[PDB]
Amino acid sequence: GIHFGNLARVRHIITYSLSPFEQRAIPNIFSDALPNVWRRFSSQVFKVAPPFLGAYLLYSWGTQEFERLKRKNPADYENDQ
């Protein structure tokens, strides 16, 4: 049903807002936006990336090692006649 009016008890908070037609859609693309895109990237790249980069190696290793086991080791036929 209706939940707009019950939600919670709030007091003493003023909020000012401007119509969309009075302001810019994507403002301060440089001075504000990108700086934070960077801000965020930084703080997170060290919690995320690591384990991925980790699995990557394990992928490259196990891959190349499965290939190595395909090739032959001369020491098997260096006695044959």
Partner: protein, 380 residues
């Protein structure tokens, strides 16, 4: 009485009371757009599905050629077939992020909304599976054979359970027709349960990234989230179409271009990408029943998450240790998928058992442990 005809009408009061006047947290991130995408997929799948059902013919001696005809002859059939098959994939991609989000943000604390979710996942899986069997290709067949054979692990009622499943004493026509029936049906059951999923949700309201009550700040779904979802749609839609139009078969196994052969199991038999991770686990346990149980649990373990929550906070936003563990887990699945796409030979076999063991520990032991630990570091 009721002034507007939006709040009184026994029907519009619903379109309005569940998607237009709905109270939504003002800070839900992009990770919340998957709900709608999942929803949209369902309708798109169902639609393209019917269109196809109008040209398919559930019969071993005619399945493969019907689909082939559907493409080469039916006007735009080829496009519809594509969309349906690739939707299946984008459906799973979306559902996986939908789940991750829930996991990372403790949305699972919404138990019923969650449990119905898990039910949804299982249903979508069963559906996508039997769909994949209809064209009656090589995977189609051997897939049908292995999965129905899984019941054979259940003692006693097992070997019988397989008999129904097939309708005979070895996969054949009856299996294919009761599969088409089943496929035709399930999607609706999905749509049905989806309604409940969303209904339980509504009791509480959406969760939000910081995991603290957003009653002090709700906003009307429309136009905030309706517009945000339209956009989120045009984004998923771009690679979905870029894929389906420019590189159709990128995501799909080619064995299914070879009409089923009851006598030959292809040497490179893998399942569709979205099942690999499980296929990987199944191939870990070198025992019939163990592998089966591990497989079952590999998905059913989702039912336990809500109960393995120890943090005093709801999300991982402010839990750096859980985060690392969380992302370590993702990379963990990402590996099993690779493993599932490789042969049963060293070094794979060992790497495999590891990732599996790893999967179940990060979920049953670690998370709940690091969670408790974190509580102490906050001095709680």
């Amino acid at each position: 009485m009721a002034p507007n005809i939006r709040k009184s009408h026994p029907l519009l009061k619903m379109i309005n009371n569940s998607l237009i006047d709905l109270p939504a947290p003002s800070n839900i991130s992009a990770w919340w757009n998957f709900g709608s995408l999942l929803a949209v997929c369902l309708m798109t799948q169902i639609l393209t599905g019917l269109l196809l059902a109008m040209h398919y013919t559930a019969d071993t001696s005619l399945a493969f050629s019907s689909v082939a005809h559907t493409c080469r002859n039916v006007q735009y059939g080829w496009l519809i077939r594509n969309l349906h098959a690739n939707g299946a994939s984008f459906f799973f991609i979306c559902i996986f992020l939908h789940i991750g989000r829930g996991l990372y943000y403790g949305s699972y604390l919404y138990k019923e909304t969650w449990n119905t979710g898990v039910i949804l996942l299982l249903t979508l899986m069963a559906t996508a599976f039997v769909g994949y069997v209809l064209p009656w290709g090589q995977m189609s067949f051997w897939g049908a054979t292995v999965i129905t054979n899984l019941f054979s692990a259940i003692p006693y009622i097992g070997h019988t359970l397989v008999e129904w499943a097939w309708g005979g004493f070895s996969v054949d026509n009856p299996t294919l027709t009761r599969f088409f029936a089943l496929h035709f049906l399930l999607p609706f059951a999905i749509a049905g349960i989806t309604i409940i999923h969303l209904t339980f949700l509504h009791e509480s309201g959406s969760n939000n990234p910081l995991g603290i009550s957003s009653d002090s700040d709700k906003i009307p779904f429309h136009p905030y989230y309706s517009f945000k979802d339209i956009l989120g749609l045009t984004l998923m839609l771009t690679p979905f179409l870029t894929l389906a139009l420019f590189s159709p078969n990128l995501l799909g196994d080619p064995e299914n271009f070879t009409p089923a052969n009851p006598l030959v199991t292809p040497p490179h038999i893998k399942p569709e990408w979205y099942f690999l991770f499980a296929y990987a686990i199944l191939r870990s346990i070198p025992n019939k029943l163990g592998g089966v149980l591990a497989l079952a649990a590999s998905v059913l373990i989702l039912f336990l998450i809500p109960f393995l929550h120890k943090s005093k906070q709801r999300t991982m936003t402010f839990r750096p240790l859980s985060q690392t563990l969380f992302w370590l887990l993702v990379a963990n699945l990402l590996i099993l998928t690779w493993i599932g796409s490789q042969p049963v030979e060293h070094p794979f076999i060992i790497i495999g058992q590891m990732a599996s063991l790893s999967y179940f520990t990060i979920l049953l032991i670690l998370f709940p442990t690091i969670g408790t630990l974190e509580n102490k570091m906050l001095n709680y």
